Scaffold this active site. Structure first.
Site, PDB file in Angstrom:
ATOM      1  N   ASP A 180      45.071  22.513 -24.148  1.00 31.20           N
ATOM      2  CA  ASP A 180      45.909  23.642 -23.769  1.00 31.20           C
ATOM      3  C   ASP A 180      46.610  24.202 -25.013  1.00 31.20           C
ATOM      4  OD1 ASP A 180      47.494  25.288 -21.964  1.00 31.20           O
ATOM      5  OD2 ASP A 180      49.147  23.954 -22.366  1.00 31.20           O
ATOM      6  N   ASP A 205      49.767  26.801 -25.015  1.00 28.01           N
ATOM      7  CA  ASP A 205      51.217  26.991 -24.855  1.00 28.01           C
ATOM      8  C   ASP A 205      51.887  25.734 -24.309  1.00 28.01           C
ATOM      9  OD1 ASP A 205      50.383  29.624 -25.436  1.00 28.01           O
ATOM     10  OD2 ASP A 205      51.381  30.554 -23.807  1.00 28.01           O
ATOM     11  N   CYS A 209      41.633  32.610 -20.017  1.00 23.61           N
ATOM     12  CA  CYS A 209      41.731  33.398 -18.804  1.00 23.61           C
ATOM     13  C   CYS A 209      42.910  34.375 -18.939  1.00 23.61           C
ATOM     14  CB  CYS A 209      41.920  32.503 -17.573  1.00 23.61           C
ATOM     15  SG  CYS A 209      42.455  33.436 -16.114  1.00 23.61           S
TER      16      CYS A 209
HETATM   17  N1  LIG Z   1      52.047  30.843 -21.298  1.00 21.69           N
HETATM   18  C1  LIG Z   1      51.384  30.685 -20.005  1.00 21.69           C
HETATM   19  C2  LIG Z   1      50.361  29.567 -20.146  1.00 21.69           C
HETATM   20  O1  LIG Z   1      49.634  29.521 -21.130  1.00 21.69           O
HETATM   21  C3  LIG Z   1      50.628  31.942 -19.571  1.00 21.69           C
HETATM   22  C4  LIG Z   1      51.494  33.173 -19.431  1.00 21.69           C
HETATM   23  C5  LIG Z   1      51.312  34.371 -20.113  1.00 21.69           C
HETATM   24  N2  LIG Z   1      52.269  35.232 -19.689  1.00 21.69           N
HETATM   25  C6  LIG Z   1      53.046  34.571 -18.793  1.00 21.69           C
HETATM   26  N3  LIG Z   1      52.564  33.321 -18.618  1.00 21.69           N
HETATM   27 CL   LIG Z   2      47.646  27.233 -19.092  1.00 20.89          CL
HETATM   28 MG   LIG Z   3      50.792  24.581 -21.383  1.00 26.79          MG
HETATM   29 ZN   LIG Z   4      40.704  34.391 -14.953  1.00 23.78          ZN
END
Ligand SMILES: N[C@H](CO)Cc1c[nH]c[nH+]1
Ligand SMILES: [Cl-]
Ligand SMILES: [Mg+2]
Ligand SMILES: [Zn+2]
Ligand SMILES: [Cl-]
Ligand SMILES: [Cl-]
Ligand SMILES: [Cl-]
Ligand SMILES: [Mg+2]
Ligand SMILES: [Zn+2]
Lengths: 160, 158
Positions: free
Chosen positions: A7, A9, A91
């Site tokens: 992963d 973030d 994604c």
């Molecule tokens: N950072 C989250 C997971 O990677 C995905 C996201 C983008 N914008 C809001 N949420």
């Molecule tokens: Cl994620």
């Molecule tokens: Mg994460």
């Molecule tokens: Zn998707």
């Protein structure tokens, strides 16, 4: 072939608690020890694949250009330091889109489902990463900066 | 007596913008190959690290402090989070035309260190870094991404 599905973030870099979007350079921060520990894992024979949900990426809610600066710098750090991701799988969909590719669905990794399942892992900080591991028929490691951090993972996955 | 590496920033730790020699935007920041694992290796071998850099006109109109701060502080985040620690970051902000006392290869910034001299080095990509080494009475390594790079230095000094 052993793979690590990792992963982004909250795992490779910190995840902003406001909107969960690394959409400015002042929101980019590496997790401790990720670089030396990925190099260690690679030296033990693991290949690396990045897998991440980026809600609304490429739309006005999260413009591609805003994502690109920090992401490309992150990747330049990895590459220049010798960390090579075979693929970076993203994604871009919103949850309400009900797409085929949003983790913990396995569409993005269908080609890997091919690998040594006993010795391959998903590494991520959320329940969804652990569920991805279950859906893939492999092990899940729940990253936590204190209780299961990069040094610990580097040690655990090279134990013999 | 402590072994030191006095390491230039631009063109040595990170890429030197060919355009205008100022890392004044985030999109101009790029790390040199292998600098992190090799500095970690050098630290494990007992070297302490000191960064030393000439930043022409820093804190004036052609190079505001704020423009320098963003990329620099981020570069520092990345190094620190990965275990690389600099004892000091030494900066000369002056223009060459200023004829100041602190511009490499002048020795003012590092006076305090003037240290195991036989095992201490200046590492940088310019002739002036090599001259600084001579003025300090220690060894000089001329960093070159292609011909005398971080893996080579890590190997040599350990
Ligand atoms: N950072 C989250 C997971 O990677 C995905 C996201 C983008 N914008 C809001 N949420
Ligand atoms: Cl994620
Ligand atoms: Mg994460
Ligand atoms: Zn998707
Ligand atoms: Cl935030
Ligand atoms: Cl990003
Ligand atoms: Cl310089
Ligand atoms: Mg230089
Ligand atoms: Zn000066």
């Amino acid at each position: 072939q052993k793979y690590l599905f990792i992963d982004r973030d909250g795992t490779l870099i910190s995840e902003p608690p406001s909107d969960f979007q690394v959409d400015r350079f002042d929101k980019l921060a590496f997790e401790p020890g990720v670089i030396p520990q990925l190099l260690k894992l690679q030296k033990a024979g693991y290949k690396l694949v990045m897998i991440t949900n980026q809600d609304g990426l490429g739309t006005q809610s999260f413009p591609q250009a805003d994502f690109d600066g920090p992401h490309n710098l992150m990747m330049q750090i990895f590459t220049s330091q010798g960390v090579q991701f075979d693929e970076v799988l993203i994604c871009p969909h919103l949850p309400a889109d009900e797409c085929d590719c949003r983790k913990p669905k396995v569409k993005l990794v269908e080609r890997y489902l091919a690998m040594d399942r006993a010795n391959s892992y998903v590494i991520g900080d959320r329940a969804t990463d652990i569920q991805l591991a279950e859906n893939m028929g492999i092990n899940g490691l729940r990253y936590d900066r204190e209780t299961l951090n990069w040094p610990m993972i580097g040690e655990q996955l090279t134990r013999r």
